[PDB]
Amino acid sequence: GSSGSSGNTKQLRFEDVVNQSSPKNCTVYCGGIASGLTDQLMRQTFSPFGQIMEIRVFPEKGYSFVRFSTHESAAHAIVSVNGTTIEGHVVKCYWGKESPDMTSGPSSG
């Protein structure tokens, strides 16, 4: 028989992901692919994971966007995709947050 145990606390808990960001804004930032980024890919990949609203593939930056109609579905695909290898390329699933358009006044801490 074989053995191999040396891990503790990994990935992201569904309860943690389904809260990180407001329930109103549900986005999934999938970054990793470089020589295999295609709308059909992300669509088919998240297709089942849940319902997809908008998809943006950036084969020049090495990342893509995927927003769901709900927070749950998004969290599911995230908790999973978060640490998966597509076509031999590790991808990262995050909560696509809208960039700050207006704010004025930097900070630090």
Side-chain angles (χ1 to χ4, degrees):
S2 277
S3 199
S5 205
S6 204
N8 247 299
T9 301
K10 292 263 233 103
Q11 67 158 81
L12 296 156
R13 257 288 123 187
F14 169 84
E15 291 147 286
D16 246 286
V17 180
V18 71
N19 98 70
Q20 270 202 350
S21 92
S22 306
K24 297 117 203 227
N25 152 84
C26 338
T27 310
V28 183
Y29 165 94
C30 207
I33 311 126
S35 232
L37 224 209
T38 47
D39 229 289
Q40 179 133 272
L41 186 68
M42 300 302 93
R43 168 196 221 185
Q44 212 140 34
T45 287
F46 291 104
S47 142
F49 265 123
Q51 195 149 54
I52 302 158
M53 320 322 301
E54 213 153 272
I55 294 183
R56 248 299 110 167
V57 314
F58 277 65
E60 75 222 275
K61 288 307 226 154
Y63 84 98
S64 161
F65 260 126
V66 184
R67 290 182 309 156
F68 292 66
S69 44
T70 59
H71 199 69
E72 278 161 52
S73 298
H76 288 287
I78 286 174
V79 294
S80 275
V81 167
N82 177 293
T84 60
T85 316
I86 291 173
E87 302 286 298
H89 305 271
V90 40
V91 307
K92 66 198 97 125
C93 244
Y94 304 138
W95 277 116
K97 291 236 100 241
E98 283 160 313
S99 260
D101 36 61
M102 212 200 246
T103 306
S104 259
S107 223
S108 235

